[PDB]
C-alpha cells in the first residue's frame, strides 16, 4: 500500500477519512501532544524515510522554533511538493500582528471548517496523484467528508449569527482562535499571543481582566492542553465563569468525545455557541 506519514492527529484523522484502509498511515505527534517544537523518535525517522507521501500543516506549525519537520525531511531526503505537502496550501492566511511576512503566518488554520475542507482537498489530490488506482475512491470520500464538514460549518454559522453581538467574544488562554474568529464572526480575546515565551504572567492576566470588565461576554473558555490556572484567575477576577474546556491542536483519544477532526470541531462549536448564548 501507499506509505503515508502525517505530522499530527488532526491531519492523520482527515487523511483516514479520505483514504480508509487503502494506505499504510503513520502519525508523528501523538494525540494530546503539541505539534510545535516536538522531538521525533527513531520510528518517526524510519517511517518518514520510507514514506511515499508526507503531510504537514505548514504555515510555521512544525517548521518554526526547533524546525523539527524541516530536519526530518532533510535527513530523509524528501522533497517539497514531490514527497511532502503542506495541507494548508490554499488557505486565506492570517498573520501575527497583521504583518504579511514569511514566517509570521498563524498556523491554526484548522479551527475553522472551511480550512479543514481545504486540508481534505489537498490530501485527496495528493493521494490520487501517488495512487491513481484508488482515485475514484479518494474522490468519493472527499465529497462525503467535505459535505459533512460543510453542513456543520453552515449550521454553526447560523447559530453564531443569532447570538446578541454584545455576548460574542471567544476568550481563551492563547490567541489560537483567529481563524475561528474570521470564519464564524466572533472576535478573539486572550491572555497571551501565539509564540510568547512567558505564558500567563501578571501583566497579561491584568490586561485581559481589564478588557473583559468592559464587556458583556457571559462565558470564558479554556484549552484542554494548557495550564488552566491563568484563565481560572481571569475567571475569578472578572466573575465570568469558564463554560467549557475546548480542543485546539489535537483530537481526543479514540472512544472519547472529540476523537476525530469532525467531532473535535463539533464539540468546540457546540460548546462555544452554547456558552456565548448564556
Numbering used by the authors: 32 to 309
Sentences from the paper on this structure:
The pneumococcus acquires Mn2+ via the PsaBCA permease, which comprises the ATP-binding cassette (ABC) transporter, PsaBC, and a cell-surface solute-binding protein (SBP), PsaA. Similar to other ABC permeases, the SBP PsaA defines the specificity of the uptake pathway. However, our recent studies showed that the functional specificity of the Psa permease in Mn2+ acquisition arose not from the specificity of Mn2+ binding by PsaA, but instead resulted from the concerted action of protein metal ion coordination chemistry and structural rearrangements that prevented release of other divalent transition metal ions, such as Zn2+, into the permease, despite their ability to bind to PsaA8.
We further analysed the metal-binding site coordination geometry by use of an Asp280 variant isoform (PsaA-D280N), as it would be incapable of facilitating the trigonal-bipyramidal coordination observed in wild-type PsaA8. The structure of PsaA-D280N bound to Cd2+, refined to 1.7 Å resolution, revealed a partially solvated Cd ion loosely interacting with residue Glu205. Consistent with these observations, PsaA-D280N was greatly impaired in Cd2+ binding.
